[PDB]
Write a protein that binds this ligand. Structure first.
Ligand code: 6NM
Ligand code: 6NM
Lengths: 546, 546
């Protein structure tokens, strides 16, 4: 019974095969068939390529030995290599051309999701080329999805030597009959087969995947579109910055490139961005996913005034000062979306670009009290219920698991009416004791919010709603300004409080505003529609946030 | 009696003054004298510039109002503005041309070092230009050195209005006679003077500094060269990555740009790089200053084998994997210098560039046991003393303050002979109970090492020396390789163990090696000669590490 799947890198998890380029090159240059492929394997186990693959020498040391071999092979063939013929250039192009074979990776992900131990076993080299980073990036992205990465040049062994297969089985802690081994090289398949492992000769991915599906009994082809990569909290880099004596901010950090600061809503976490963090880092950005003040590992002081927009924004500026960042792109959702508009209005020099999910930008009405303004819209009754200190804390903290299960639902699953909350006497008065689990979340993900909320509770988070007059007076100072830095407004069709039509006048104060729109999407935008949020953010970041 | 110094930004802490550009422009374009300067101040307190300075409008909103004003001023003058005349371009160039007035900053640093409360009071704007980052960077660098930054556009008040001076005095919690106020605008000096504050009209810096020196009684001119900026541990961003179940790595993080991973020696800390961290971040790099395994906030497992080079290097690769970094430049000192050469030899694809302070690269001798090799050099006797588990721990842990005070000394201060340590029976047998404090360190800095070493002690750190045979067998696998990635070897003239001549054969295995050499420098390179280390590293990073 199968419990492990092993994949070759070249010609299997990555395409086009770097090997096929020696053939592609012979044809393009009208050189004798197999000439370059023969100089590549010259001397077999004693040869230059085997020393390279075993890690005896680096790729840069190997280049002149391959050129030497290419000339000896051409001499014997009674042919000539052209003037400008470069092995370096041939391999630079080949490696740079090789991309992840997405459906093969998807199959490995599915097998691992179904309990399989997965591994990459590859004959590879120690890359010291000036352009080594592209391959390093590829290996980084690929390896995260597997339990093991076994590279020939690191283990000093090579396929097809039988020791590498015995090394593979020992790392897997599995007997050969429990293992599927996928390879594009028949000679490299034989020792695994000779040992009793299930082997797959990979020519085209589809047939290989049909064979893999047949042998595992797991559907891998014609599968529904998968969710983006998520985050395992214990596998992240956790950051901590003291912004003032009693206040520290926590964040999760992934990737390199322009700083992208993710600002969650109520009652959330850095973990609300779980589906965006790996995708944005993969797109070339340094992601800083915050635990906003009052949440998770960030400080939660009790005072209401510690949560007014002026203070929260000043502290976010200090956060950047302490990390030595002159700028960051600011992406917010719900309450974080509102903070992000105020960061753009008050600190445009610190904001590279600004994006909001659901939260529109609406200027303060100087001729109406913010309390009057909230009362005018029936769907904002929940914010009036949030005013009195202790009332919403008591209900929200009564049963954490019920709180998160009732809140975090897709638009078609909603257990809560946002209408007449005060009159009802609470958010959950017409809600079950044991809500069913939404299709958006697992039990484990609910328990992460439950565990995070056990530290400080709902007081600090609820305090974000308790500064309406303070925020209105501050916001009124910005009434003559416009947002002229790059900006994105993303609307959610089925957010019945932050309705798409609420954002309709935004180009009056943000003329160059860019937009995104998500169909059949509720309030919990990031987990409701992760694939579309990722597509909208990556597209905007690459075009407008450099 | 003076206790506060206040500085204007334009024409005082930053030069050339952005104001002077309107004059420079009139002359270059042969326009009527004071024409542009007049359109700049048009309408006075009611005018466009005052609204800009109070934060009513942004810089981008102000540009067309200034152009409108420039045309009204030119009309009245019976002159014409040329075809291609752009206010945007004039201010883009001016702001971009304005740099920190280094000796004025040096004086403020000196006054603050002498107990003064320092502040920047400036009439500034909300910058939303596409090129706003340059000014954001300038403000970031400048503000860190002061207790307060008061910006007109943030406080809604402007100089010379008297409310801004009353606001300044309230933030300072000081009466006017206790305050020096430096400004280049006489009209802006008057209200501070009228209040009883000591005022300095700043034309040329030297005279202003002579006046400041006269009035404070503190030497600010002709001062000895200052040390680079240091780090305050509680003001840094602290990072934590779990590399395996029982092992977590701690780091300090500052700046943006290519990742630069700093690897300390024995018995050190991330804090050994205190003088390099602000300088390298300021030069355009993202600095990751490690607490190496066994130190500070990083895990310190007891097992000797947890500290062999193969394991330490694998964990540093995992560290990069978890932070989502495909590469980092690796800079090491002492034991960290040795790790950094092995990172280049075993993982060149993960190493952007490699630099070592003091530690040379010497290949393993396959025909001699590493123990025999250590015995061959008299100055390496301390490593033999470090072999037996518990002996060096007991001595090193007996009195922490004495340990760090005895170790951390300049070449001319040394209390320890590195000769016949085993025979003597310890490192400190001929050392005082209460060593004097070295000129390289303060009491406070010694106490930081003392506090860090109280957690795990010396076992994990000493274990780095306890894998000589394991490291030799691993290193022997790399005997056919060369280091062909960018590399820097920095030697310290007076390191009497890691002597400069020990690095003499390095170009045999690193042909493109670049070098640095520090005169009159002991073992503790980073704190012994911080200014020169910074100059050598920044120069090499900008030329070779992109
Ligand atoms: F705690 C509250 F009040 F439920 C809360 C808090 C924050 C946002 C929202 C929200 N905004 N838009 C839609 C929703 C929503 C509707 C139905 N179920 C859950 C959420 C509601
Ligand atoms: F603990 C030890 F053994 F002192 C130790 C540990 C690590 C490095 C060094 C070292 N390397 N080069 C010079 C020195 C040195 C010489 C004189 N005083 C202090 C240090 C010494």
């Amino acid at each position: 019974t199968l419990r492990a799947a092993v994949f070759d890198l070249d010609g299997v998890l990555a395409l086009p095969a770097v090997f096929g380029v020696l053939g592609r090159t012979e044809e393009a240059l009208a050189l004798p068939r197999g000439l370059l492929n023969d100089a590549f394997q010259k001397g077999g186990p004693e040869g230059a390529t085997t020393r390279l693959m075993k890690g005896e020498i680096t790729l840069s040391q190997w280049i002149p030995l391959m050129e030497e071999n290419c000339r000896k092979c051409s001499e014997t063939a009674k042919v000539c290599l052209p003037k400008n013929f470069s092995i370096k250039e041939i391999f630079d192009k080949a490696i740079s051309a090789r991309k992840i074979n997405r459906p093969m990776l998807q199959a490995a992900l599915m097998l691992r999701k179904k309990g399989f131990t997965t591994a990459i076993l590859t004959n590879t080299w120690l890359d010291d080329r000036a352009e080594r980073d592209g391959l390093a990036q590829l290996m980084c992205e690929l390896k995260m999805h597997f339990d093991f990465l076994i590279e020939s040049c690191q283990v000093g062994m090579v396929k097809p030597e039988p020791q590498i297969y015995k090394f593979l089985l020992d790392t897997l802690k599995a007997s050969p009959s429990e293992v599927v081994f996928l390879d594009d090289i028949g000679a490299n398949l034989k020792p695994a087969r000779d040992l009793g492992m299930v082997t797959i000769l990979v020519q085209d991915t589809d047939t290989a995947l049909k064979e893999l599906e047949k042998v595992t009994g797991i559907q891998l082809l014609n599968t529904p579109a998968p969710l983006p990569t998520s985050c395992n909290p214990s596998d992240m880099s956790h950051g901590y910055v003291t912004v003032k004596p009693r206040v520290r901010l926590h964040f999760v950090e992934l990737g390199s490139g322009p700083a992208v600061c993710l600002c969650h809503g109520f009652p959330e976490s850095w973990y609300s961005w779980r589906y965006q963090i790996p995708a944005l880092a993969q797109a070339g950005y340094r992601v800083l996913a915050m635990d906003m003040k009052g949440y998770g590992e960030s400080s939660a002081p009790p005072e209401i005034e510690e949560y007014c927009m002026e203070v929260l924004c000043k502290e976010m500026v200090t956060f950047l000062d302490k990390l030595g960042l002159s700028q960051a792109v600011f992406i917010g959702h719900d309450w974080g979306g509102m903070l992000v508009w105020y960061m753009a209005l008050f600190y445009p020099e610190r904001v590279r670009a600004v994006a909001s999910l659901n939260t529109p930008f609406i200027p303060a009405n100087p001729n109406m009290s913010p309390l009057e303004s909230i009362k005018a819209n029936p769907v904002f009754d929940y914010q009036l219920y949030f005013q009195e200190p202790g009332v919403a804390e008591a209900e929200l903290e009564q049963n954490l698991s019920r709180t998160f299960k009732s809140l975090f639902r897709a638009s078609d699953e909603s257990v809560l009416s946002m209408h007449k909350v005060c009159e009802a006497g609470g958010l959950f008065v017409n809600s079950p004791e044991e809500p069913s689990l939404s299709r958006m979340v697992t039990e484990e993900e609910i328990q992460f919010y439950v565990q995070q909320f056990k530290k400080s509770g709902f007081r600090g988070p609820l305090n974000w709603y308790r500064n309406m007059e303070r925020n209105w007076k501050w916001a009124c100072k910005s009434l003559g300004r416009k947002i002229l830095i790059p900006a994105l407004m993303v609307t959610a069709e089925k957010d019945f409080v932050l309705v798409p039509q609420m954002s309709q006048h935004m180009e009056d104060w943000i003329p160059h505003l860019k937009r995104g729109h998500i169909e059949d999407c509720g309030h919990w935008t990031q987990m409701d529609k992760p694939t579309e949020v990722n597509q909208i953010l990556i597209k905007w970041l690459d075009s407008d946030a450099r």
